Design an enzyme around this catalytic site. Sequence first.
Site, short mmCIF file in Angstrom:
data_model
loop_
_atom_site.label_atom_id
_atom_site.label_comp_id
_atom_site.label_asym_id
_atom_site.label_seq_id
_atom_site.Cartn_x
_atom_site.Cartn_y
_atom_site.Cartn_z
N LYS A 157 22.21 -5.31 35.38
CA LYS A 157 23.07 -6.10 34.94
C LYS A 157 22.60 -7.47 35.37
CE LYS A 157 25.89 -4.65 38.81
NZ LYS A 157 24.81 -3.73 39.31
N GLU A 183 24.07 -11.14 46.51
CA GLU A 183 22.89 -10.64 45.86
C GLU A 183 21.63 -10.83 46.47
OE1 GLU A 183 24.52 -8.16 44.04
OE2 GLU A 183 22.50 -8.44 43.08
N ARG A 184 20.41 -10.70 46.11
CA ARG A 184 19.49 -10.86 46.83
C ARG A 184 18.96 -12.42 46.82
NH1 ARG A 184 18.59 -7.05 42.77
NH2 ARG A 184 18.29 -4.84 43.54
N1 ADP Z 1 16.27 -4.90 29.45
C1 ADP Z 1 15.34 -4.30 30.53
N2 ADP Z 1 14.11 -3.98 30.11
C2 ADP Z 1 13.36 -3.22 30.79
N3 ADP Z 1 13.80 -3.07 31.97
C3 ADP Z 1 15.01 -3.05 32.62
C4 ADP Z 1 15.89 -3.83 31.80
N4 ADP Z 1 17.29 -4.05 32.48
C5 ADP Z 1 16.98 -3.38 33.44
N5 ADP Z 1 15.69 -3.14 33.52
C6 ADP Z 1 15.10 -2.24 34.73
O1 ADP Z 1 16.25 -1.94 35.82
C7 ADP Z 1 15.99 -2.64 36.92
C8 ADP Z 1 17.07 -2.85 37.72
O2 ADP Z 1 17.81 -3.73 36.86
P1 ADP Z 1 18.50 -5.06 37.79
O3 ADP Z 1 19.26 -6.02 36.87
O4 ADP Z 1 17.53 -5.66 38.84
O5 ADP Z 1 19.50 -3.94 38.38
P2 ADP Z 1 21.00 -4.29 38.99
O6 ADP Z 1 21.70 -3.87 37.79
O7 ADP Z 1 21.22 -3.51 40.18
O8 ADP Z 1 21.13 -5.74 39.44
C9 ADP Z 1 15.01 -3.43 36.81
O9 ADP Z 1 14.04 -3.64 37.90
C10 ADP Z 1 14.25 -3.33 35.47
O10 ADP Z 1 13.03 -2.49 35.57
MG MG Z 2 21.51 -7.33 41.03
#
Ligand code: ADP
Ligand code: MG
Lengths: 542, 523
Positions: A157, A183-184
């Site tokens: 997300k 968040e980070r």
């Molecule tokens: N559209 C995407 N394409 C490729 N990898 C994705 C995508 N969305 C998420 N990811 C993978 O999922 C991991 C977590 O997504 P992130 O948005 O950082 O997590 P959160 O939902 O906890 O914020 C990312 O590090 C990425 O590697």
């Molecule tokens: Mg996040």
Amino acid sequence: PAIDAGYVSQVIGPVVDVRFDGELPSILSSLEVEGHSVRLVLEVAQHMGDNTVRCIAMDSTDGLVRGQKVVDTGSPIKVPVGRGTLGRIMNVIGEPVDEQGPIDAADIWSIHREAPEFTEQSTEQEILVTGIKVVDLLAPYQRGGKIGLFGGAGVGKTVLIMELINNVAKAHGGFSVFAGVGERTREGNDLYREMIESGVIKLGAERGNSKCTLVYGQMNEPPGARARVALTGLTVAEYFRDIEGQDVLLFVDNIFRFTQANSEVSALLGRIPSAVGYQPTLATDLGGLQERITTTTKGSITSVQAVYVPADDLTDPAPATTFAHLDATTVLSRSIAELGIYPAVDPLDSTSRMLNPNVIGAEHYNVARGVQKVLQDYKNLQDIIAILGMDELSEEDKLTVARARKIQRFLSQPFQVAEVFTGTPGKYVDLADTISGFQGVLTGKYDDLPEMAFYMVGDIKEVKEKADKMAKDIASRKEADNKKVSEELKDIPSLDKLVSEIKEVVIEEDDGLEEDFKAEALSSETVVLNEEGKSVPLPKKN
Amino acid sequence: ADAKALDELRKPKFSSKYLIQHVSQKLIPAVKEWEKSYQPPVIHLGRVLSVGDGIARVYGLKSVQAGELVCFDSGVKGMALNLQADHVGVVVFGNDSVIHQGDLVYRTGQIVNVPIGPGTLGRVTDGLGQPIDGKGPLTNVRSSLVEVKAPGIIARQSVREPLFTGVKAVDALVPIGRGQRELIIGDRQTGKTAVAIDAIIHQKNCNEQVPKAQRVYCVYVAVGQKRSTVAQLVKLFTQTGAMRYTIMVSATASDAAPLQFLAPYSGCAMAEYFRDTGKHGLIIYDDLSKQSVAYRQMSLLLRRPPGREAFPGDVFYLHSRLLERAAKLSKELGGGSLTAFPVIETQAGDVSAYIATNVISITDGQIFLETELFYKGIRPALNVGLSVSRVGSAAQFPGMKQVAGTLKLELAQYREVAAFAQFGSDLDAATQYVLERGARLTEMLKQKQFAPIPIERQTVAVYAATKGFLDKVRVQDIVAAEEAVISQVNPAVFKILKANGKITPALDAHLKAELRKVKLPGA
Ligand SMILES: Nc1ncnc2c1ncn2[C@@H]1O[C@H](COP(=O)(O)OP(=O)(O)O)[C@@H](O)[C@H]1O
Ligand SMILES: [Mg+2]
Ligand SMILES: Nc1ncnc2c1ncn2[C@@H]1O[C@H](COP(=O)(O)OP(=O)(O)OP(=O)(O)O)[C@@H](O)[C@H]1O
Ligand SMILES: [Mg+2]
């Protein structure tokens, strides 16, 4: 001067009691602690009853002594608002945390205000094109709507909210506010540096041509700071909505952290806990924050909130409470992400108020409902398929399983913000192309193509391109045997001729550890303070 | 009884003083005859009202700061958690069986701090900085706070330097940036500790080849472990020489839950010395899932309301304010870094647990270690479909980045065709090709314990596998095949690959040439 300058009565973590011997501050008022190492603002939460107010610290309370002078400011936390806040980073109390100097304040608004009235509301439903296939097809966004991205720690997300920033916040010609809540700090630095690169944020004398303002309450902050920083970002957005009178984009990364911060605080306020562990005021704190984020008749706020779900639990009270505040709820699933499908959007759990044929047109609506019908039918078949295999299915069932696998892979999409770690360049898929492609895969126009031709492509031209290419590469696997550019005399030196061009490094042998280290003389006895505040050894008695 | 009505009682309204003067001539002689039974009154010192469950209530201490080291007169430290109107609740860094009611508590004037500096380098300390290795006090050291706030947005830069772990699976697939935070999450006995130990041993091997500023000073924080495990680990770090660069903080399973709660903050304050003075630090919090359990113990003994699973609600903040200090600083702050490896034990592979999904949404990636790969002998048992490192990607070794995209893709297709055919009867003979290549590569990436590999000897080893050069070897002799490849390749190409950073086309030519005169054991 003593009255309306009270003193710290008791300190329990993020929660400070201050006793005022006359004329108590109001609830939500801001109080300043004198003599702290940093600026410590205390927001009044309750009147405890014996000339004592109960406060929430906006910074750390490590160092508060139980007599410390606390100065009432007579007003709530006021943050700088205006066009001069554009391009700057602010914290919870409105201070610049980007080292660019003081913030040019057109006004300073308190971060506590009521929601707009029922007469002020706006009932206008135009679509917001995001360039995302699953978002535009199945749960389309409203241009003045509250949008929620629901996810479970690692499902994507933040990557979805960054892709929505990249797609939406450039065509949308207004101002943006990014309220980073819980968040980070690394991600705030990432977004700040990539906005300086793409010119959304401009530094120095070009600062007035910035389009985004950042408010950050990241996950190193104390619980009182992360509980009020969303209100600071809301105040910055509400100035542009109410005073400048124009469209704002508000992106809030993890509005769950607001609820979690008030749940950390609420334990020490002497409240009986509600369900799972939360404050009794979850619905009303969340609703009072969320009902300020609206479009009124004088301006628009398109809101995108990431919502965290605590243990992949969509029935947890904070996600279940915030579901009813949104116009479009895009629910990200971990099971979709584990199949490699990105964005990991659950298509049978993502809803909108725009999926209505009187709003989007019957072509779009019928394609979306047919896609959902095929996916739900496959979901009903999956329990049989996992046990009895696909050999026990009907031919009608085999057709819907094949079509549903194709439309599951076709909902996935490469993102432009994901290409720095996936390597695949991202595609912006137009809405007309989304509707036409998904209609074609529904009717059976593309049953000739395999399943993996649909995976991580933009539109249906690229499915046929990838399906020609995968078929084309079914033969071409060899003839890298000789006729090289990598034999010994093509342009090649010898190996020892390569060795002498190595820049030899000098290894310094001493680690540089005591360069300017001022070692203090640690005592081999515990030095303590006696009754007169004087440093003495610990007395040898028990 | 209104406070309006209790405020009028400050004004004298007796209108007769026939026993004010009667007792005020008699009060002092009656107090004087009971002086054997008076404990001396306490204002700036403290006296223990009540001790129990590792939390003491302390009367007095009028001028203690919140969050301050206090010292009980029996020499046990404490921390003033909550200052109340009538008492101070302190949290005892030790066993509370030596604190009595009526004991003296001494304020020390300083918020909870540990010795940091160059002189703690090499030592084995407890959760509060006192050494337990027996070789004397911490010398050449200075005191710094354990609850420092993490650097802000403007104090950071993105991670660029590539922090080699020495594990082929990690350095090829899940590569680690130098200011990154990488979760090592797995079940019990899945090789979680072994990855972090290999990273520390590899930093010892790399610190003697880099010029004094690219050195990485490791910190191992062992929370809730056994003390025999920590003794064996200090023996290993001493005999490999890695204790020259390692600090070893240990709050073992016998220790108090305040010490286990505080020990990652102590180790983080010790490693932030290397972050703040321009050097690079590595910190391993082994079982952060045990620091969460110790903090849950402290919170339920403080009668704070339990939330999900029983955890206090600020158990996210516990780990977030810990791991946010693992940063990469900007050039105006010295350019130092601190890389964190939190370790979370998972129960039966349940990644959807509370503390697991907390630390996943704090750290920059994950390294998932599966029991089904570990039981089969694929060690390190790295779940390649779930392990991820997005901040360290495009910040890894350039030759390894040129080679390993094909490796990630080939293991991806191996996972696809093992997701299709978990039983072997239908062979496409092109699916048999990707099965044979995947089985070759997953034999390539698995390695042995306590021997990390340099990154050029991993680049060449996965270059020889993602290309041809190993299809002669069947499936068993690959562990000897890669050792034969490392042995029989002329060791100049390792120097060119290390010095240049990537495989130049001249080096690609010499590398394709040198991988043909290699005597493979499968023949
Ligand atoms: N559209 C995407 N394409 C490729 N990898 C994705 C995508 N969305 C998420 N990811 C993978 O999922 C991991 C977590 O997504 P992130 O948005 O950082 O997590 P959160 O939902 O906890 O914020 C990312 O590090 C990425 O590697
Ligand atoms: Mg996040
Ligand atoms: N890469 C490897 N190759 C061979 N054996 C290994 C490897 N990694 C670990 N082992 C063996 O597996 C066992 C478990 O290793 P390790 O202690 O690292 O797991 P763990 O996750 O720390 O378990 P716990 O947390 O319960 O201590 C050890 O006895 C070790 O000898
Ligand atoms: Mg272990």
